[PDB]
Structures are given as structure tokens and as C-alpha cells.
Amino acid sequence: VQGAGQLRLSIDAQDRVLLLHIIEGKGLISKQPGTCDPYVKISLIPEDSRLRHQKTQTVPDCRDPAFHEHFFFPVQEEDDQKRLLVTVWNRASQSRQSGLIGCMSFGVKSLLTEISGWYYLLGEHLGRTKHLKVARRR
Amino acid sequence: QGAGQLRLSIDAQDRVLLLHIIEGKGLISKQPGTCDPYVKISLIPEDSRLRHQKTQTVPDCRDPAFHEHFFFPVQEEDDQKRLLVTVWNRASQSRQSGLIGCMSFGVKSLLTKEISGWYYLLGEHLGRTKHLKVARRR
């Protein structure tokens, strides 16, 4: 699964404080059998800690979820070489069973020097290395 | 790139992984300062750290001797995940700890494969996709 769907988001930086707006998702593809109950988790990588992780609500049984949630992710100089990871998960009753639908990432330093629109959900490996916007072709 | 080598052993016993993290060699940390490594074991992808396990942190040593045994129980639902072995360079605050290198092993394959000896520490992206043993060359 190369393209697991699309996510609409916005990212703006304000004095070393990342403002993320996770709007909605579309055409989500989950290889797990059953309902699609997605949520979005934001974090930085690589980082051996989850204290900074943040997530949206879980939208039950929907392949085109409307999140409409804003996040404030503060970053510091020491985070410049990390990447902001945005991951869509398919919730399971027990966390360890939750499957990864797709992900994408943005370099932290590059975000401090604006993102907005639809982006593709990439694979568990590829998504940690880049992001790909959905062309507007306007 | 190669961030050093790690000597380990992995054996499966009735859906219970027995890992033996022996020692590391030639560790390369791009962070300025002492090299204070520790090894963290986990499964990916997985939105939870409850199953994560780590070794002691060996202060100021590029060829650390861990000599630690781990028991990582896995279940049928974990077959499609990968066992990730990551070497971290400890910082006073976790978020500042840098990743030295990593490698991974498919869970299903581990239940079949003879993991015992020296392996290369791969990059933060490549290491989540495979492992590479250090050839004995007879």
C-alpha cells in the first residue's frame, strides 16, 4: 500500500511554536479487516519519549474523517534536525492492536523558515522521510 | 551509513523472544560530547511504549559491554510487525538523546533464521526495514 489516502492539514510557525490544524482525511485505506476508526498522532522523530506526542479524537467507522482540531507543538533549537511526523492510526480496543494507516513528515528546521492543503498518506517507512502534497493542478 | 556494530542473539521459545544484547563496537554519534549508549527494544509499528525494554546506559564508551538478557513476549497479532533494536546516546533530558543507529527483524521470520553474532547499526530509516550481519568470512 503506497497511497493510503489523503489528509488535509495546515502548519504554521510562531516563535518556535508549531501551530498544526488537522482538518480532515479522505479515502483512508486500512489493510486491517473491519471498521476504519482513525485518529491522527503528531510527534517528532527521532526521539525516545512520548511526552510530546499529541493526537486527535478517534472518528468511528469513517474513511473520510472530519477532525477539525488545532494543535500547538512547541519546538526548541535542539529539535531543528528532527522531523515532525504526522501519523494516521486505525484504533483497536487495545493500543498494541491499532494499525498504521499512513504517515508523512516535515523537517523541523524547514518549518521554521508555511504548509496548507491536501497531502498523501505514505507507508510506515517512506512517510518518515518526506511528504507529498496532492497536486492542485489549478 | 554504518554507525557501528552490535553483537546480539535472538531465539524464540513458544512465542517468547529471548534477546541477548552482548556488546557494541565502534559506535559513531554525530552529537558533540561523550558517547553514553543504551539499547532499546520495541516492536513497530505500534502506538504504545508499554512493551519497550532497554539496557543500562554505559557511560563514555564507544564499545559498550551490555551483557543483558531480555524476554519479549509476542502474539499472533504481532507477526506482521518488526522487532526494532535501537542504540541511543543518552542526554540529561530524554528529548535530547540522539539516535546512534538501529536494525530490525521481522517478527514472523523470528519464529522460524539464526540471529547470533555481530550486526551493523543502520540509519534511522533504513534500520527499520532490515538488518545486516557483519560477515564472518569463514
Curated annotation (Swiss-Prot), chain A:
Q: How is it modified after translation?
A: Phosphorylated by cyclic GMP-dependent protein kinase.
Q: Where is the C2 domain?
A: 3-119
Please state where this protein is localized.
Cytoplasm; Nucleus; Cell membrane
- Specify the superkingdom: Eukaryota
Q: Which ranges form a coiled coil?
A: none
Describe, as the record does, how this protein assembles with itself and its partners.
Binds EFNB1 and EFNB2. Binds the GNB1-GNG2 heterodimer.
Q: What does this protein do?
A: Down-regulates signaling from heterotrimeric G-proteins by increasing the GTPase activity of the alpha subunits, thereby driving them into their inactive GDP-bound form. Down-regulates G-protein-mediated release of inositol phosphates and activation of MAP kinases.
This protein is called: Regulator of G-protein signaling 3
Say which residues of the entire protein are included here.
135 to 275 of 1198
